[PDB]
Structure formats: C-alpha cells, structure tokens
Design a protein around this ligand. Structure first.
Ligand code: HEM
Ligand code: HEM
Ligand code: HEM
Ligand code: HEM
Ligand SMILES: CC(C)(C)OC(=O)NCCSC[C@H](NC1CCCC1)C(=O)NCc1cccnc1
Lengths: 457, 457, 457, 457
C-alpha cells in the first residue's frame, strides 16, 4: 500500500513501515505542511499509517474538490476514531445522512435567525466587562483564554439551550462542568496516533461503547436536553429551532442531542482561542488597537451598545479579524475522502485517497503574501481585499461543507471585541510570550497561554 | 442494535447477547430457514452476531430486490472475511468495480463462446468413461464425488488455461494439487462463526495479509498465469478470453488472476457436488434413469457423441437436472446488502440490513410444491414448467447478479451425464445412504458421501 | 476449553459458546451464587467466558486455599481489565511484587498507628453531626449515602494526605471532585462483560494507555502527591507513613502514588455503603437502636467523646456491625488463581482455574444460620460468637491476603456510629424501601438509595 | 517502555516508536548482531517492538544464564506467536511442564538408544547413494538441499514412526507431503514482524484456533499417530519410546503427538541445511575433502559400512563438522526470558527482559577466532580444541535447555557424510555461488541454493 504515490509520479517523503510519515508530526501539522510545500512544490503525498494523503495547493484544483465535485466525489471527511451515537452529528455524518442533516440545520444559521440572537450575546458581553474590570481594578496580569473561555461558554449555554450562567463566577455549576470537557481533539496525543497506526482497532472500540466523547458528558446532555425538550414542551435558541424543525426526514431526538453537543464542541474552544489570538495581536501592535478603538467609538458613540447593523458597519474590525485568521486558521487543514477514481485538473486520484488542503501553510505562503509572518490588517482593506484568492484564504473552508457556523462565529467574536475595547486597553506583560510560539502539538494554540495587562479607560 | 426488528414490527426468534441467533445454526442454514418460514410467515428477521438479516419469501418483493432496485439499492453481497487481493474477484467486488468487472467477463460466457468450448469438455467426457469402466470392470462400489471431482477438475483445467491433465490418474500433478484446495467455504466452521461474532477482527486479519484463500494456492496460480500469459504472449480458453479483453477500464493483470481463481473455486466442487446429487436421484429412481437412457439414445444413436445442439435438444435431461437443483440448490440462500433506507412492496428496510432469500426452504415449500420432498422431474414438463414461479425457483439466483456461469455449468453437467448414461447404469449399494441425509453443516452436501454400484451396458 | 468441569466430574450449569454462563448474571452474582449452592451442592463450576471458575463451600478446603497453600499455589486474584501503572497497587499486584508491597504497607496498619489516627477521624465525626443536625432541624428525609459519603471522604482526605475539607459543603473543591470519581467497579456493566467475553482485548487496551482508572483522576493525584511529597519534604498520615517507609526494595514514588489511590478507592464507597446498610437495619429494628444508644451512653456519659479504648469497649456495637456484614458482605466473593496443578482436600484442581468463595451465599446459608434473612445481632453475642465458623463468615476475607484495611475500616465506622447515635434517632420514611431490595447489578448496594428521617435527641 | 536500557546505562541503537529497532533487521539477525557487537561492546540492548532484548557476550555471564540460574531465573524462551496444542511441545513449553516433559523424553536420546538406531539410519544412507549415482551417471549439476532433504526426511520417517519411504522417488506419498510443510520459521517474514509489532494480537489469533503450525499437517499427524499407536498397540523408534514411556506425570496422548511433530520440524530442515553447508565447504576446500576421504577409508576399508563405534572413531570428521557449525550455527541466537529481578556478574537485569546470546556473531569474532571467515577445521584439532571456550562456541546452545537432539543430529549427519564421501567427490559448478552469500532473511541459509557437480569414485 505504500507504493501508491510512487506509482502516480507524485513526490513526497519516504514512509517507514506501519508508521508512514507520522514521525514527521514531531513539529506539528503546520510545520510539516510548510516544510513539505517548500520541498515538494504544488502537490505532494504522504501516509498517515497506511492511509495515503495527498496535498494540493492549486486554487483551481481546490475549488473542484471543495465546490464542483463536492457532491459526486469529495463528500465526506476522514474517520478519526470511535464515535458511538455522535456518528449522527453533522460534522461527522456522511453522504446522504449528511445532506439531509445539513438541510435541517441550515435555516437555524440564517442572517435572519442571527439578528435575533444578538441581544442575548450582548447581555454576556456586559457580564464580561464586569469580570474584566474586577481584574483591571486589581492590577494583576490577565489570562485571556480563561476570561474569554468563560465568555464563549456563557454565550453558547444561552444560545443553544437558554440556560443563563455566569460560568466564570459559577465554575462549579454542573451544567458548566460537563460542558467544559468538550475540548478540541489533540490528533497527535498518544491515543489518536495509535488509531492512526491501528485504525483496525477503531471497530473493536465501537463495539465496546467506548467513544472519543466521554460517555458521561454526552449522557448528561442527552437527558438535559430531553428535560428542556419536555419543559418547553409545553410552556429563540438553537434547541428551540431544532425542536421546531422536527415539527414537520425530520430530526430525530438522539439526532437532535448529537447536533447540540457538536455546536458546543464547535463554538467553545474556537471562539475562545480565536479571541485570544486577536488580543495578542492587538497588544503587540498598539497602533492597530488605537485605530480600532476609534472606529468603534465613531459608530457607537458614548460607548453605545453595538447592534447587528452597527457590527457589519465596522470595516477595520473585519480587517483585524480576517488577518488574525490568516496567521491562525485554527482548523489548520481541510480534508475530503475521494469516493471514486477521478481525474481533476489533469491529475488522476485513485479511490479512498484522502485529499488535503494545508490552510496554515497557504495563509503563510510568500508567493501569495508579502511579509507573511507580519501582522498587517491592511491586506483586507476594501482596496486590497479584492486581490486575495478565496481558495488560498480559507479559514472557514469553502463549498457545501464549509463552516455552517461562520456568520454566527464572526458576530459572536466581534460583539465581544467591541464591548471590550470600548472599555479597556491591553498591554503586554513581562511574562507575555513575545513573539508567540505556536504549540508543536496537534492544535493551533499558543505554546504558552497568553497573559496580558488590562487597564480601564 | 438488537432491537431493530422488534421496532419495525417484524417477527422472529430472540437474539442472545453477542451471538444473535447463530446458536440456531446447529441444524444448518437449511433446517433453520425451513423452521423459520413455518413459524413466522412470509417475512422474518434474525441476527448473525449484531448483523441484522431479514428473510423474505414474497416473489414480487424478491424481484424488486434482485432485479428492479438491484443497481440503486441492493447491489452487493455481505462481506464474510479477510480476502486480500481476492477483493477484486467479481463475486466479491462491490458496486462500480463490480459493474465494470461484470462487463469485462460477460462476453466470455456467451452462447457463442460456449458452443466453441464443447469439443474440449467432450474430450474429458471420454477420459471419464475409461476411468469409470475400470471400476465397473472391477465390481467395487464407486464414490461419485471422486470420479466426478476428477472430471469437473479436468474440464476446468482445460477450459480456463488449456492445461490438460487426467487428474484422477495424475493426482499428484502440482497443478492438480494446489487447485484441489479451492473448496467451498464452511460458513459454520469454528473460524467463520468467530468472524460472525467478531467481524471487528476481519480488519486485523487483512492487515496481517491473512486471507481465506490459502496464500500458497493463490501465489501458485498468480505466477502460473503470468507464465501462461507470457508463453502464449507470444506464440480458445477463459484466460485467452481475458487476455484478449485487456487488449482494449481494461482488465488488470492481478484482476485477471483473481477471476481465474474464482472460476475454479466456482465450478469445481459445484459441478462435482451437483453431478453427485443427480446420480443419487437417478439410482434411487430407476424408472427415471431408464427413461433418460432411452431419450439419450434417440437423439444420439449408436452412442453418438453429443454436440452443443443435440444437448439443448434433450428435454427429460433438462427436467431431471432442474428437479435436482430444486431439492439441492447448493447456494442455499441468496443475499444482498441494503445500501439505503428504502421501502419496497410496502415494507420499510433500514440501511445496512442484509436481505436474504432462503432458496432451499422455498424450493421445498408445500404451498408451491406438491409432495416437495419427493423426486418428481415431471414438475418441469413443458406442460407444467409454466406454472413454476421463477422467483420461487432460483438455483442460479436472478437478475443482474445471477450466476454468470449458469449456461456453462448446465452444459458441463449435461455433457457428462449423457456420455456416462450412454455407457453405464448406476445401482444402489448396501453401503448407500437411503434416504440421503443432508449435512447439518454449512454446505449443501450429503451427510455420508454417495457410493453406488456401476455396470457396463 | 468448555469441557473442563465435565471431565473432572464436577457439576454445574451448561455454558453457551463464547459467553459461558455469564447470561446467568442477570440477577447478579449474589442470586446466581445462592441458586448454584442450592442446586449443585458443596462445590460447582461455571465459565466466565472461557475462564473456568470453580466454587467451593467447605470451610476446610477454603482454609487451605486462603491460608495453607496461599504462598505456594493460590497467591493472586483474577485480572479484570487494563490497569496501566495501577498494575503496582497492592490489591492488583501479583506474587513477589505483592509480598514485597504487602510488607512495606503493613506497619502502616498496626493497632499502634491506628490509635494515633483516632483524634483526626474524631474531628470529622463532629463535622458530620453539625451537617446532620442541619437536616434534622429542617424535617426533610435524609439520604445517608450522601451524608456518609461526605463523611467517609472527609476521613480519607485527612488520613491519607492531611488535606482537611468539609466535602459536603465544599463539593466543588478540586481535591473533592477528582476523588469522588474513584467508585467501586460494576463488573456487570457493558464494558466488563465484554472484557469477560474478549479478555484477548485487554492487551490491546493496555497498549493504548487506556485504563479502568480514568486517566485524569490518577494524573491529578500523581502530581498532587509529588507536591505534598515535596512540601512536607521538607517542612501522621498514610502518605507520611509511606514516605517514611521509602526512607530505608523500598517504595518507589509511582508505587507510592498507586497505593495512595487504592486506599481512597478502597475506603470510600465501602465505608459509605456499609454505614448505610447499618442505619437501614437500625431504623427497621428500633429495639436494637435503643439498646445501642444506651450502651454508648454508658461507656461515654454526658455524650463523652469516644476514644480508641472506649470503642473496643463496646460489645453490642461490634455485634450490630458484624451482623450487618453478614447480610451485606460488600466484597460478595473471594477469588484466587490456581497457579499449579494441585490437589487439596481430595479434589484435583488443574492450573489456571479461578477458585472462588461465595461469601454472600454462605453468610445466608440456612445450614449455618438460623433464620438467615432476619437481622439478629445476638448471633455474635460472646455466648454464641464461638459457634461461628471463621471460614464461613468472611466479610474481610482471610489469610495472608485478607483485607489489609480491616482494623481501620472497623474503627472508622464505629467512631461514626457512636457520635451519630449519641445525638440522633433514625426513623423510616414512607419513601423508605422496606424491605430493602438489593441491586440486581454487580455491586452489593440497595436497589433504591436509603432515605431516613432523623430527629435530634 | 522504551527508556529501560537508557536508565540502566546500557548502550545500544535508538528505538523508533512502536517498531523499536526492527527496521535494523533489513540485513538479517546475523549482520545486525555483528554490527552491534562491534559498535557497542560486550553488552547492549535493543527493542523488538516494545520487547526489550539485551545482548551479552561475556562467557561467564553466559554460563550463569544458561547453566547456573537456569532453573531459578532464566527457564523459558520468548513466545513468538499463536501455537494451539503445540503449546505442549517441549521446545515451546515453560517452567514445570517443561521440566516434566524434558524428563520424559530424555531417555529417548541416550547414547544407548542411539546406538540402536544406527542400522536404520544406515539403510537410508544406502538409498541416498543410489539416488546420487543416478545423477552422477547423468552429469547434471546437483542440488544438495533436495537430495539431502530427501535423505534427512527419510531418516526421520523411519526413526520416529517406522514408516519407510524413499521420499525422493515417492515425493507424492501423503505421509511425505504433509511432513515437508514443517519448515523452519522465517521470523522476518510479513507475519512474524507484525506479531513483533502487535504481540497483543497473538491472543486474538489463539482464540481463533489459528496456529503457526498449519492446522492440516498437525491434524494429519495427530490421527496418523493415533493409528500407529493402536496398530502397534497391539501387535525401536521415537514413538515406541514415547508410548513405552506413557506406560508408567506420564505422557498424555496429545502431548505425545506434539513432541513427535516437533522432532520432525527440528530434525528436518536442520539436518538437511547443515549437510548442505558442509558439502559447500568441502567442495571449495578440495584439500580437506581429500584428507577426509582418506580417513574414512582407513577406518572403513573396502568401503566398509560405518558403525556407531567406527563413527566416533573419526576425528577429522568431527573437526570438519564442528568448523562448519562455527561458520553456520543455524540457531543464530540463543534466548531466555528473565523471570525475576536479578543481578548476574555485576549487572542488574529487570524482570521480563529477554536475554540473548548472539551465536553467529561470536563464532565469527576476531577476538576469539584467527581469520574467522576462513574455513579452517584445524581449530578443532585435539591440540587446539582445548583453547576453545564452550560458552563462545555454542551451536547446540548449553545447559539444561541445550539441544536435546544433539547426539542424534551429529550421528545422523556423520553417517550420511561417510557413506557419501566413500563413493563420490564433489566439485563446484560454474552456477555455484562462490563465495556463498548468506540470506538477508531470518534463517541461516544460503542466498542462492547450493549446486555442485558429483563424480563416481
Ligand atoms: C472562529 C470560529 C470558527 C472557525 C475559524 C471555523 C472554521 C471551520 C472550518 C475551516 C471548517 C471546515 C470547513 C470545511 O471542511 O471546508 C468548519 C466546519 C464546521 N464548523 Fe466551524 N469554524 C468556527 C466556528 C464554528 C462555530 C461557532 C460553529 C457553531 C455551530 C461551527 C460549526 C461547524 C460545523 C457544523 C462544521 C462542519 C460542517 C459540515 O461538515 O457540514 N463552527 N469550521
Ligand atoms: C451447478 C453449478 C452452479 C450453481 C447451482 C450456481 C448457482 C449460483 C448462485 C445461486 C449464485 C448467486 C446468484 C445471486 O446472487 O443471485 C451464483 C453466483 C455466481 N456464480 Fe454460480 N452457480 C453454479 C456454477 C457456477 C460456475 C461453473 C461458474 C463459473 C464461473 C459460476 C460463477 C459464478 C459467479 C462469478 C457468481 C457471482 C456473480 C456476480 O456476483 O456477479 N457459477 N451461482
Ligand atoms: C467496610 C469496609 C471493608 C470491607 C467489608 C472489606 C473487605 C475486604 C475483602 C473481603 C477483601 C478481600 C480479602 C481476600 O481477598 O481474602 C478486601 C481486600 C482489601 N482491602 Fe478491604 N474491606 C474494607 C475496607 C477496606 C479499607 C478501608 C481499606 C483501606 C486501605 C481496605 C484495603 C484493602 C486492600 C489493600 C485489600 C487487598 C489486600 C491484598 O490484596 O493484599 N479495605 N477487603
Ligand atoms: C544440526 C542439527 C541441530 C543443531 C545445530 C541444533 C541446535 C540447537 C540449538 C542451538 C538449540 C537451542 C539450545 C538452547 O536454547 O540453548 C536447539 C534446541 C532444541 N533442539 Fe536442536 N539442533 C539440531 C538438531 C536437532 C534435532 C535433530 C533434534 C531432534 C529432536 C533437536 C531437538 C531440539 C529440541 C527439542 C530443542 C529445545 C530443547 C528444549 O527446549 O528443552 N534439535 N537445537
Ligand atoms: C449468500 C450466502 C453468503 C448466504 O451464501 C453464498 O454465498 N453461497 C455461495 C454462492 S454466491 C457467492 C460465493 N462466494 C464468492 C463471493 C465470496 C467468495 C466467493 C461464490 O459465488 N462462490 C463461487 C460459486 C459458488 C457457487 C456457485 N457459483 C459460484
């Protein structure tokens, strides 16, 4: 099985027996990917165990994979481990169950439904401020991922189930506890590496009701939901929206529980981690932070409360957000299984091959980005934003399987940043890691957690 | 997983934990199936481990499965174990590789190509006679499966590769040895039962290059073929026909080796075992045997050599053959995986369910057959043959995945039977098992091997 | 493998393929064991999967197993699953690592060291009272396992590491949280039953650093200990005692962490569950409760604080405790692997066979106990205590591998019961389950949790 | 687990994750071992998967392992795969079953019993001659392993069961066929390498009655023996000797079948392969061959038939044999599992570590052997034989677990060589591989099979 790329005249690094090239993940996906791109060119291959994975960096080729032949050929992502009933979550589901599921949950994420969610996310914007000011009034360096974790959790709890907790001060609410265990997967920790070497063991685990989702969190929420379900039934949030949907092919109950869980998992560490990357960049580029605080005050004078419309109004805000995702695209890669022997843009792809787009590397490619490591929001000026290829810059992926939660993720984050910058300024501490070193692990996240000083305006 | 049939209001026997109903295979597939049909009605379910298997006996419903929605829904059979490169044999291949493969091998089985193969199969008809007469001249009771095994092997060797061995007298020819190990699979022996309980182990075995096809036989033939291939290339048989085919999507070389192997496996014990069932029936119904010997002598007077055309000429011959397959349909069941949630003839079939047609039981069903256990060829008289439902009587299955080798199997067998009955008469011995008890195992085959007395006409 | 007992002329129930007799655990170990004893006699066998397990109820035979040939033949218990570094905990360790470990931890459990621990366990006796009175003053039915759980945890935290938490009011102390997850193992839950059917999977799990001890609790305590270790080093409890021991074959650090963990696991739900069984019995036998409260007040007048010496002073106290363990011997069984072909008291035991003593059943055997189901403490009167066979009554097992923590467990429990009965009386509620039904699961524990009314004296 | 040798300050090559150093077996055990010895010194370690294996080359240390603490510590060899009932063969059995089994089979291999076997092995010496002369009279280059295979098989068949076949001319005798499949194990073929990486899969295989001994050969012999057993019972060979032994702790029947099988496996390819190595050396050192033919003719004039006593009479014969085993010690390594934490000759060996003696390398060590690659029988002259350390030269191992079949193996081989050299001379062909390259695989055997010219004296 290790001769496939050698036969198709595709270049790449040499796979050791059983391991493939996984030993080369010792500097993380990102670094490996950047190195590979440099050595091998526009396309290359490698092996995750016996799994062949082919990399591609041609925007046209990418578009065909992610848009054109999405339905016919490149419809699903790669399996990664045992999942139990979470087999039915949309980000995991495959082919027709997916298309079906994608349909039942899309109206939930309209610009319409989203404009309705704005006042709630706004209320926890406030709760954030109060908590921050408590630390700002006690001149003690702040850990963002905490305060932001607390926030991002606060907004999920309230927008998916309408449970309204100040998780930062109520860390020990059972509803807060279980949900905090739903953290992004380290695909380079002991366990998943083994799965990569012995995927033949995945079935043995499924048959043991072992799941990568801790059996206790899921069981907590399954019943939590079936309570909420039958407390609102009968007597505005994602659950409501999903309960309304199965009031017609219609969403099953366990299906409904599954999605709910994934929304938490999806929004939680991601909204948290991204907000952290942005405060780091703002504090190490004080000019940008000033330019922002002034735009914010112009649209929203007297520290006016942001709205759905005043948010899309702000352009330097969108630029700062976008540039950050360029430097830190927390998905790192996009991936699709090739379900048929196909030929796309002149290249034969055999079946079962996993096709991969190395986002991190591309967002940091000198051939598309002047001074790529530098933090320069002006790349996204309405003057230069046009020059940017949508299939090189893909922080939310692209095509029928792009991030369903993108509009929501972007607003969530911006509503926070405004209210925060309306009130404080963020200054580097001595214990602040400048320049931020990235984790050599399997998540896009800082080597050392970001600590900053905060001051009241 | 064991609640599926209970939910769909389908009846059946209660599955024990992990085993399902496999413990009920202690009297073999056939008996279990007959019992089930009687208890539970027109449709029922059971579990091979965790695998749900639904039985169906409505001819309409059957037709939809085997013909109508063959391509869309019910395209493949159930996996059964580790297969290695034999993954590419047609009877094993799935979906598009299958349709493709089915296409490249069909012209090989035309009435045209078959009429060309007749003189070769005829030559080993002769070799059979000589061997039989040696035993007939030495009044020693004969074991058919041997003499017939020897024959059926002789015809394969010669029709697939043109190697011409008298295997009965050359039992120790390397080409004869390897090929005799390709015997039908006992799906109720220790090994396959475990596979049924731990299908999650199948992948562990594949990854150990362990295959249910002994790694030595296959390796013998792979190279045997790549010799023949390059001895004829360059300087009438199935190999020729397949080599000509890849002289164009065209048949690969290892693909070609795979099919060759399956043709042997397919034709060998089957042509042998069926010919045995027929001699048993003939000898325990001496009237039928006389009626046959007289028809044979009328079409072919002076013991004239049968031809392609004189063979299709013989009608009592076809009746005797057909009735035998009714009583002994060596496939026992037909099976299809349900690849989508579907509804056929008013019944909801969830995905992944294996759908099954219990041939043996149906061929022995009193509601379609008067005195079913009795051996009465007149059921297939051109007068009554019309009254027989093609979707109740299915010894070669039906629809796009029916037995590719049916015409060939039927002629093979008839060419033998004529030449044999032209010369001898077969009389029961005292050591003959009357009435023939069927094996309680996982193959349709006699409990005790068939021994008969043979006399020269 | 399933023919072993059939060959040795030992009776028992018939094992199904792969499962053995595990299907007969549907009414729990206890019931199965009681039934078996009745049907089959003094000795019998059955199969946990392919594992042969032989039961024995002859006190002599038992003594040989648990005492005489302990070292030579019956030294270890049966493996049960993947354990990681907890392979080194004493209750799990085998043979020479065990004997060694047993030696390094025994001085920790002297009558000497124990008399020193009495004032600390006394302080949380007090904390218990206050908490109870809060519920007693608010006439709301009380759940014992909670209040007692809280207590039993309080005493462990303080006696193993000197951390002093009121866990009932501090439920959300990180030290309290992790440790509450160390609960007795349900050997009849989905997971362990599978392990019993596929013990061949245990090694696959070990090789995945999966452990039946949640990898987070253990990792919390490993470092927690290595802090305490290096905070006391340098600047009375089990840790001290173990740190002093490795200040010499001497206790390693990870070895030390392992034992610490097992002491928690051991003492926690056990001290809790037993105290619960006793309050149930006391409240459904009000006479006994009065007789006790009067003995307590005689030794300790003016609600005097109990001491080590006033505790061993109390005889009706010991009787009540003992009788409870008769009815509820929370270990249920004792077990030893037979490491050699041996013959003990006239019976040939082949190697690898697990030998078992069915405590629950024996403690409830009419041939040794008049009215066994009845609760009658007088069985243990210094007059009748003599008539009781130590190898029929074994709540703490017996011999070199008996419960290392017995003296400590007994004092712990009695110190609680005195202080509690000194202050309140416990009366059945309407929601109280009379008579207590036992869990049909794999732990000795009540079907419904015990709720009682509590009143201030 | 990969840090063990690093901790004990033992040197060696760096293990990759999961594989250990197995990738370094690409030039075979022998080469790896020679390289290691050179780099790392007198002792070193490496990992076969996760299995630590420590090498040792100090003769004293070796003696302690193989003799002194054999019983107490280093009693068994390493498991290698699934074995089924062959678990009971002596070379596989462990600890007390071994000691027992070793005792019941030792009297079978006395100098006494051996002197009785000499005339039978002599008769097939003759059959060899006739076959050789047929090739010698038809000047066609000869393949030794064949003719010798044929011989070595002939002598086993006759000495273990008294079945008397000329296997070279009867290649197709069922008794000859099955037994020829019992060939030495390639511990570097796909299968065993996987076992080395996933030893956790060995139990899954055992539970599938899969055995590294083909289930058909063993089943053939099991019944073959139980026939012979009951044909001689009732109405001189190893079977007789074992049947007599169980006529007394006494040999069971399946136990008996197991040993019989191992004797075949043991003697077959080994006697064959060694005889081949010797003819190669003789023909590439024509001087030695002449010196031998003259000694042979002196003890046995007029081509007199060798006897037990005339065989031990011949000293250049013993020298030639011995030197060959120096250059080609077909066991390659000796191995013992360390069953306890021990310290031997100043070195701490933790438990479970496999201890290894690299025979091949040591026999070719310049520090003990002048011109080691050269073939010089005079090393074993009764003058220099004294200077040779028995714990450096170990072709049959040493100590309580040395080759049980050594006396027999040596006589077998010498009886052949005499009768052969009495009649022919062996001259290199052009197609002869000079100098013989060794297989880079996992058996000591020539890269290309040895072909020589043979001439009649
Ligand atoms: C900063 C925040 C986020 C970023 C940068 C991000 C990025 C991504 C990316 C790159 C993908 C894969 C797209 C592809 O495969 O082409 C994805 C998938 C997905 N995201 Fe997000 N995402 C974010 C937040 C969220 C949030 C808040 C939700 C809330 C539900 C969400 C729900 C999903 C779902 C359901 C998928 C898989 C869609 C499918 O398979 O049909 N994401 N995201
Ligand atoms: C007495 C002889 C035979 C009988 C009674 C018989 C019967 C059957 C039956 C019932 C099936 C399954 C049909 C279905 O799934 O609906 C089958 C499949 C098949 N048979 Fe035969 N068969 C015979 C001989 C042969 C021979 C001689 C060949 C020679 C190549 C052959 C080749 C095949 C193949 C390739 C399949 C699977 C077809 C596919 O999956 O595309 N069979 N046979
Ligand atoms: C009500 C409380 C308890 C009861 C009824 C109880 C009973 C038992 C029983 C029956 C055994 C098995 C004995 C055998 O195999 O023969 C045992 C083992 C053991 N118990 Fe307890 N036990 C209790 C509490 C404790 C406590 C508080 C500790 C504190 C450390 C403890 C530590 C242990 C250990 C370490 C073993 C295994 C000993 C060894 O394998 O060397 N137990 N217990
Ligand atoms: C040229 C022929 C042979 C050579 C060079 C040879 C060499 C060896 C070696 C080096 C060992 C391992 C010794 C150790 O572990 O220290 C061994 C083991 C063994 N050999 Fe041989 N051997 C030969 C032939 C035979 C024959 C003909 C038999 C006939 C039965 C035999 C039976 C055994 C047995 C049973 C063992 C394992 C002994 C035990 O584990 O108790 N060997 N041999
Ligand atoms: C439906 C089931 C599972 C209950 O039973 C059967 O499969 N019966 C056997 C006949 S269909 C398929 C059969 N296996 C081939 C695919 C797997 C390996 C070879 C076969 O076709 N083998 C060659 C063959 C056999 C008999 C008739 N024709 C061809």
């Amino acid at each position: 099985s290790h001769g496939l790329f050698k036969k198709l005249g595709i270049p790449g690094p040499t796979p050791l027996p059983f391991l493939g090239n996984i030993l080369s993940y010792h500097k993380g996906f990102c670094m490996f990917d950047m190195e590979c791109h440099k050595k091998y060119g526009k396309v290359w291959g490698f092996y995750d165990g016996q799994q062949p994975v082919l990399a591609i960096t041609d925007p046209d080729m990418i578009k065909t994979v992610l848009v054109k032949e999405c339905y016919s050929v490149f419809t699903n992502r790669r399996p990664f481990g045992p999942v139990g009933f979470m087999k039915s979550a949309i980000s995991i589901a495959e082919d027709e169950e997916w298309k079906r599921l994608r349909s039942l949950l899309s109206p939930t994420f309209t610009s319409g439904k989203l404009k309705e969610m704005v006042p709630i996310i706004a209320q926890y914007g406030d709760v954030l401020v109060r908590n921050l000011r408590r630390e700002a009034e006690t001149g003690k360096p702040v850990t963002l991922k905490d305060v932001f974790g607390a926030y991002s959790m606060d907004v999920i709890t309230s927008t998916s189930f309408g449970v309204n907790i100040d998780s930062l001060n109520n860390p020990q609410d059972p509803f807060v506890e279980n949900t905090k265990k739903l953290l992004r997967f380290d695909f380079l920790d002991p366990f998943f590496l083994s799965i990569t070497v012995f995927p033949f063991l995945i079935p043995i685990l499924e048959v043991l009701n072992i799941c990568v989702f801790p059996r206790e969190v899921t069981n907590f929420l399954r019943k939590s939901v079936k309570r909420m379900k039958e407390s609102r039934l009968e007597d505005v949030d994602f659950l409501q929206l999903m309960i309304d949907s199965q009031n017609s092919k219609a969403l099953s109950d366990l299906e409904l529980v599954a999605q709910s869980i994934i929304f938490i998992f999806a929004g939680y560490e991601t909204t948290s981690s991204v907000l952290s990357f942005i405060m780091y960049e703002l504090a190490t580029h004080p000019d940008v932070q000033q330019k922002l605080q002034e735009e914010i005050d112009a649209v929203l004078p007297n520290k006016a409360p942001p709205t759905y419309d005043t948010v899309l109004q702000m352009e330097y805000l969108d630029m700062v957000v976008n540039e950050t995702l360029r430097l830190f695209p927390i998905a790192m890669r996009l991936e699709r299984v090739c379900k048929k022997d196909v030929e796309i843009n002149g290249m034969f792809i055999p079946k079962g091959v996993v096709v991969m787009i190395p986002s991190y590397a591309l967002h940091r490619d000198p051939k598309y980005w002047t001074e790529p490591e530098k933090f320069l929001p002006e790349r996204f000026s309405k003057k230069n934003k046009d020059n940017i290829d949508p299939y090189i810059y893909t922080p939310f992926g692209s095509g029928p399987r792009n991030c369903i939660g993108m509009r929501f993720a972007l607003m969530n984050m911006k509503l926070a940043l405004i209210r925060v910058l309306q009130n404080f300024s963020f200054k580097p501490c001595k214990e602040t890691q400048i320049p931020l070193k990235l984790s050599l692990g399997g998540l896009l996240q800082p080597e050392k957690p970001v600590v900053l000083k905060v001051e009241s305006r």
